[PDB]
Symmetry: C3
Subunit: 219 residues, 3 copies
């Protein structure tokens, strides 16, 4: 079951990538950079999840290490997408964007180190990752939202919608991680696998459908 | 012999790097970034192949020359950056297209490494994903990236076309050698593969940048 | 004691990061990028040294302990430190990102040769070490030559600040390979505990000390 769920996920990622590629050819005022980011996220994730489907991107708790290889690239790119949405039609703040990238890469590395750790040490690393996530959300709903508001009512309305979308999904990851085999071990592996199949379909493909459709409608 | 071939390779990389350094001191309208990229590629490749010469950048698994992937994951995106910057010479940069090539290329090299670690059907899935990435890189090279070159005038576009064809002819030899040698079908012997992955990169790295830098320098006015 | 020294270091990195965050809130003409770099350096280093304090970021190898988390630290914190130095030289003028990325490439190479030297034994170790020292010498040539000439092109006052931080950085930087060679990774003349103390005290000055000196001096131009 675990193998065919990962093959299915990789196929959905490939269809999302092809959809974003088709949109890119009639871009309706959205810069090519947004289409490139929207394609890299699912292709990279698709490849990492294909490695799990093939029996390769895990070692035996089972550590699904290919998830961290995925997220360490896909998650900073998602925050770049969200930052570029806030900045659409205005000056870029690349400092703020790279602040999110740095927090996010740190967050994913702490999760990988937490997974390889035992006891108190595990929850130290996990806590540092959660703190990085809180700072990401403070930026999202604070200074980054203020840039979105500076770019007019329609853009700020779209940004708010994708900020809530992204944030609601993002808080689910560390919650599932803590409940599952990597943390307290209350949730079963098969549950956790389905959560880390379904959540990222929404976080990667769903998010960029919502984001690119909104930005395109501003044309 | 395999150790000595890697030492010789590393020495040629050093000479190439020092030659590009010397050109950089009299740049003839070529920006400093082209000289930097042309130096990093052979110095990085030189270090990676030195590790193979010393017996460190390889392991038994059949021998995996893993230091080749450490080499290519840096030197190959930089070579595509060089090609892209040639297409954009005298005109506006399209860094979105440049980074598209980087992303495709890093993915291609990683699928190679994973293919080398794999056995059976799995090996050929990773290899095929790498080949698809290469095909897209060549579609970009001869389609949108060439249209940028054509926008920068006749002489630049002629040079771009020479460099693009030179790169493409060498680049298709890599996955061809991979598939024929011990990592794939095991038709060619280890030594044969080693010599191909010594001689190809001398032309791909040092050769490419000699052609590219000389062609850009010739466009210089006074 | 080694564990407690690392906990104390991480705490000092966190206090430094918080000080730079507080300065960033009233920035006095210094761009946000300088404050971000000044925060990332100590947070990253603090995390890497936390892994040593917890007993994770080290292993036994040749009957000696490799503090591998130092190289994880330095491969990110050291290129950021050179970026901070380069941005100081360019303050009030056109950026030279080519020269900045030249220093980043040299620096990342230098740290990687150190890591490989640490994993090596005999002649091989000193080959890798020597390549990293060559990279450091080139970094220092850049720092006191072309990068200082950029600082001089941004006027007397900026160039005086640049020269101060260039000397500060360089004096600490030459200590690292010196300690490395004397200590258990090299000749084994200095004891493990001495090398641990050196690689605690030096980085407090290199990371937090450097950004205090750099940011105070830039803020005073306001
Ligand atoms: C945890 C990994 C650490 C990686 C560090 C990455 C971030 C630090 C680097 C600095 C980025 C600064 C960006 C400068 C852009 C200025 C232009 C602008 O603000 O629009
Ligand atoms: C050892 C690993 C090497 C990794 C770093 C490689 C860096 C090579 C890339 C070149 C960057 C070019 C900088 C862009 C130039 C813009 C114009 C300028 O301000 O000079
Ligand atoms: C490919 C693009 C990025 C994703 C790749 C990461 C997964 C790699 C897993 C390789 C492990 C192979 C070992 C084995 O065959 O058991
Ligand atoms: C649940 C996670 C907690 C944090 C959510 C975001 C915090 C509030 C955003 C800060 C608003 C602001 O800076 O004006
Ligand atoms: C949807 C179906 C509900 C199945 C149970 C939901 C997850 C509970 C967690 C667990 O028991 O591992
Ligand atoms: C840049 C080059 C990379 C060097 C890769 C080889 C490092 C492993 C050597 C360890 C050993 O001595 O076995
Ligand atoms: C690795 C994944 C690559 C994705 C990164 C985003 C592309 C960034 C391109 C910068 C755009 C500048 C404008 C331009 O010249 O097109
Ligand atoms: C490490 C980062 C790895 C990157 C992820 C790998 C997959 C990336 C490929 C996406 C590129 C597709 C863009 C092609 C369209 C460009 C065009 O229309 O000219
Ligand atoms: C579509 C583009 C993909 C082209 C790639 C070709 C893959 C080559 C096939 C591998 C040969 C298998 C031989 C064997 O398994 O014994
Ligand atoms: C920035 C974060 C850097 C942290 C670096 C390394 C983490 C240490 C790796 C975990 C080792 C697990 C413990 C063990 O080996 O028994
Ligand atoms: C392998 C590890 C490599 C990681 C290196 C970390 C990144 C290094 C430094 C780049 C900083 C560039 C900052 C440019 C600032 C421009 C501006 O402020 O306008
Ligand atoms: C090593 C010490 C640094 C030597 C600096 C020489 C200055 C170079 C120059 O003036 O261009
Ligand atoms: C002042 C320099 C400090 C170094 C002297 C202590 C050497 C101790 C040792 O041999 O372990
Ligand atoms: C391991 C680190 C990998 C990080 C992935 C890249 C994320 C940075 C994206 C920045 C995009 C800038 C776009 C400007 C327009
Ligand atoms: C571990 C490395 C990651 C740390 C990155 C630093 C994050 C700092 C956040 C930036 C603050 C700017 C707020 C503007 C209002
Ligand atoms: C027992 C587990 C408690 C872990 C504490 C986490 C510390 C917070 C981050 C520094
Ligand atoms: C044995 C119980 C372990 C549970 C540790 C809980 C982790 C803390 C979650 C929030 C992190 C700190 C918030 C800032
Ligand atoms: C970007 C490529 C990764 C660099 C690795 C260099 C060091 C390899 C040592 C392996 C043991
Ligand atoms: C997995 C390791 C990937 C590292 C990529 C190495 C960097 C190559 C791509 C960057 C090229 C820079 C071009 C900028 C030109 C602007 C003028
Ligand atoms: C057993 C020894 C056999 C070694 C044969 C290796 C042949 C090497 C040819 C490689 C082609 C290089 C391409 C250069 C293009 C100009
Ligand atoms: C070694 C690859 C071929 C180099 C010759 C190119 C000469 C170009 C002169 C203009
Ligand atoms: C240049 C950075 C090298 C440090 C990475 C070490 C991680 C694996 C442990 C050996
Ligand atoms: C004005 C010429 C600059 C030469 C710089 C001298 C060398 C600096 C050495 C620093 C290392 C301590
Ligand atoms: C920093 C001064 C150190 C002196 C060099 C020691 C060399 C020891 C060789 C035995
Ligand atoms: Na976006
Ligand atoms: Na070029
Ligand atoms: Na600075």
């Amino acid at each position: 079951m675990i193998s065919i769920l990962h093959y299915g996920y990789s196929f959905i990622m490939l269809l999302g990538a092809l959809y974003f590629y088709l949109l890119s050819k009639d871009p309706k005022g959205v810069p090519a950079s947004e289409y490139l980011i929207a394609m890299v996220i699912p292709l990279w994730s698709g490849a990492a999840y294909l490695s799990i489907a093939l029996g390769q991107g895990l070692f035996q708790t089972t550590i699904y290490y290919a998830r961290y290889i995925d997220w360490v690239i896909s998650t900073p790119l998602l925050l770049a997408a969200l930052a570029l949405t806030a900045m659409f039609g205005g000056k870029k703040n690349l400092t703020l964007l790279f602040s999110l990238v740095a927090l996010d890469v740190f967050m994913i590395i702490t999760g990988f180190v937490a997974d390889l750790s035992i006891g108190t040490t595990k929850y130290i690393w996990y806590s540092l990752g959660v703190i990085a996530l809180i700072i990401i959300l403070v930026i999202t709903f604070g200074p980054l939202r203020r840039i979105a508001l500076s770019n007019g009512t329609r853009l700020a309305r779209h940004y708010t919608r994708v900020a809530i979308y992204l944030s609601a999904l993002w808080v689910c990851y560390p919650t599932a991680w803590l409940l599952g085999p990597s943390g307290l071990g209350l949730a079963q592996e098969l549950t956790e696998v389905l959560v880390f199949i379904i959540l990222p379909i929404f976080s990667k493909v769903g998010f960029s459908i919502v984001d690119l459709h909104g930005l395109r409608k501003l044309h």
